[PDB]
């Protein structure tokens, strides 16, 4: 037979999940980042990234726990990444970088890595030493070769 | 935007990986023994993140290889050795399943290594590392591999002969494939080759045994055997095996001694006079797969047709002779219409033989012209015999004799009008169809001219 | 600032959700259709359709219930609509129609209604009376005007 | 595909709709009293699903309207009426919130009606039906509405006076908006019109009050008032009310008696001789919003400049006269550079006055021509006042200033000019016949110097 595939359904489901979160009903997992509680959907926060997949569905002790501990990340960064997962839109400003980049390296989401790399691309010849240090630490090939190209353009 | 960034005070100069390692190694030990209900995944991944920043991933790497190979040396190897003859294969698959779930968890909690070390240093993934270490430690032991191979070979033989387990052999087959990473080298060198060779030996024994001096039973039961083999392979073994086995079957069960089974005095090609559609159809459809196989059946058919033509053409009553020609032709084309699938090569060889003996006699054309004379002495049926009669005409290379005699008979069938129907006398020309026609028409149309 | 929006994220999230369902982990709601149990994610099955939104997140008694009895749907139809929700692909054949049509009306999902209308568009001058009766019963304007156009073409 | 379909064996006709309507009505009544923890959602929807499928949509709609209006007559109307003077605007907000959540649940369990009956019968949705029945039944009562109007009006009035709970009024104010469906008709006819009316009356009492006979204090406190009003409206009222209230403020507080606050003998435009940038800047920036407002200050300052100009022109020492011209010009352009924002109309009208009296003097060009000669009798400062001296030059309509040539002899023959090189520059500042006749005599002294 001929199967019918709809493209708008995925984004419709995403908006529906956003509306559900805004209504604040059917929340199941609560994360403590730095003493600040942020509530989220467990299954939604299980298919977004591999880290959360190995967290909410890995099979470790973390499953049967309502409150979980998310350290090494900043509350603003966690709110930003949850917002991205829930509506595929990342609001990147000057303040919410170098804490969003380390959080993105934590959770290993390629989309946030690429978005942060673009943001540092836009605002990159006065502070290239520390940016190069950060890129070498977190080991992003794209950031490194773009920085090399920028040095060449200099 | 005209704002400075200047917000990167980051440093990971803390040498305490030994502590984060010992803890991670205890975690791996606990996962190996299936105590995952009480380990903090987030903290375990944190231990993993720190080593990445500290660039001590190599210590975690060497340590991970060491811990997995240590757990494989102890509590897996002799775990299946102690069950080598007792409930074997099941223990191997169980151990394999436990190892698979353990390595899935280890990759889950150490997943950073799979994203910046494994990718950026051209080394095997954690999952692939577990698969490889299983392939190098548990299987290909030299005793586990030998026993595993024998158990699969013996079981698939008893199934070939008895009833044995089918789930386990399927699990092991799948394990052998997935142990070859993308490929199937483990399958090829572990179970494929011994199974293929033992099947070759078994089928050669069956080939020497089956020849028992019968053809229909032999060919039908060979069809049953090959169907059983393909059904078994699709059920238990893996799909890529289904190609080479069937070929080996048709290499050893029929094509090994194909020439001696086409002809045997007691039982299908030799006595095709039975005329059974199934009897020859099954034999054709079962020799169709073997390359060059069609040639031997064509040769046997050709020999029989040559002998029949020699026997029947060699003179004899003028009309029963051609009746024999046409009835043999009808019987032989019956086979190609209902026994075979109108194979081009078979049609070609029948045509060639018919062109051989029919023209071998010089009186044939005379008899073919007489046929009509006897014929002219329902009307739709007569038209049908014209089509069959026109078939031989195309075969004759000496149609000159036929038309010359047909013109000689044309006078005899015209002057006193031996022909029953005049209108058909033009139709046979239309089938026969200028000089082939006008000389046959000049005499007749003259009788039309003088009739006014 | 500039916000970065990713389009592949929604499809990736649906694919990950399908993978999680196939792994059969982190299931929360179980539906008894006609004595047959079908297991599904509650929040995933809470933003797909308004019916399920009112069921799981409405606030009625159905919330605090692991097993939920759902009627007015056939097990094949329930499985088909769950498959659509999980991967946005609807496999429509002869058997799964007039059972999927009512199921689509039960959940009031416009996409499935449109897909069933298209399937009836393709296979429609021998059984027009019963199709017209069905369309009038379930009150689909699009199906009715398509049937009128088909009668005109006749 | 060549397969027959023939798979529609459907039949549903039955008259059991009333028996299940009894159950659905009991369920709706239970939801009205907030007992939703024990009602099977799917069964309630199924009842509605069948109700709609058997074409009994009208019966269900009439029953729903009847049950919602019956719950509004009893347990809402006197529920807030019995609290009309006790904790009002809090009990009504609670009733509105309970009704809103109840209607959300009812729309949730009766959602089929909102998809195929409401849409295909050109009627109002269940949510809008609840909103309309609330708007018609509990508010616009004639007693509840009237008391609501008093409570909101008195509260905002006390706030202008005392401290009130803006948040409470925000709830009622917003409820009033959302009760108008898409629009704000209920807001316009229930709170917007009385509020604006009270504000008008209060502000007219205030306007007759503050005129106390001061300008700087008055204008600063008026600025504080409008800033309070706009913040007050944004904080407690809705966001579509800020524009009309701001216009009423600027119409009734300052534009009612703008002509009388621009000049008063005790206090800004009248006595602008103080020269304070803030003193006139506040008045400008606070009369800028009113249409025609700038005209009154334009005329007031124009009259002052005319009176100053007449006395200034009235002649008198030749040098001090032009000194008065220049420094009055400097003082008045100071206002436009630092007190105002260099308004085009303001600059135009000062230019007009300057064009009026500067040529009201026949000897003015003679004095203007003398200036240079007296000046010619730091060098950068000399260039600066030349730019200022040029400003009056353009204003004169009687340049035919012949006297520059009459003087040209007396600053050349004995060379009263201090610097010869600049003596050419002033021609360039002045810039053929306007220049050559000024150059023919001078350049001749350059000719005979070889």
Author numbering:
A (entry chain L), C (entry chain K): 24 to 147, 149 to 178
B (entry chain D): 14 to 174, 176 to 225, 227 to 282, 284 to 331, 336 to 397, 404 to 459, 464 to 482
D (entry chain C): 14 to 174, 176 to 225, 227 to 282, 284 to 331, 336 to 397, 404 to 426, 428, 430 to 459, ...
Which sentences did the original study use to describe this structure?
Among these, Cullin-RING E3 ubiquitin ligases (CRLs) stand out as multi-subunit complexes comprising the Cullin scaffold subunit, an adapter subunit, a substrate receptor subunit, as well as an E2-recruiting subunit RBX1/22,3. The ubiquitin ligase function of CRL3s is activated through dimerization. In contrast, the BTB-containing Kelch-like protein 22 (KLHL22) plays important roles in mitosis, T-cell activity and amino acid sensing. CRL3KLHL22 ubiquitylates several cellular substrates, including serine/threonine-protein kinase PLK1, programmed cell death protein 1 (PD1), and DEP domain-containing protein 5 (DEPDC5).
We then determined the cryo-EM structure of CRL3KLHL22 at an overall resolution of 3.8 Å. The overall shape of CRL3KLHL22 dimer resembles the letter ‘Z’ when projected from the top. Two CUL3-RBX1-KLHL22 protomers present in a symmetric unit forming a homodimeric assembly with an overall dimension of 220 × 120 × 120 Å. To further investigate how dimeric CRL3KLHL22 is assembled, we generated a mask for local refinement of the N-terminal dimer assembly region, and the resolution was optimized to 3.3 Å. We found that the CUL3 NA motif, together with the CUL3 CR1 domain, tightly wraps the KLHL22. The CR1 domain interacts with the BTB domain of KLHL22 over a wide area mainly through polar interactions. A well-defined hydrophobic core formed between Leu52, Phe54, Leu57, Ile122 of CUL3 and Leu83 of KLHL22 also plays a role in CUL3-RBX1 recruitment. The hydrophobic residues of the CUL3 NA motif, such as Met23, Phe21, Ile18, and Met16, project onto a hydrophobic surface of KLHL22 formed by Leu161, Phe162, Leu158, and Val155. Although the density corresponding to aa 14–24 is clear enough, the density corresponding to aa 1–13 of CUL3 is blurry, which suggests greater dynamics of CUL3 aa 1–13. Furthermore, our structure of dimeric CRL3KLHL22 reveals that the dynamics of dimeric assembly leads CRL3KLHL22 to a transition between a compact conformation and a relaxed conformation, which gives CRL3KLHL22 a variable ubiquitination zone.
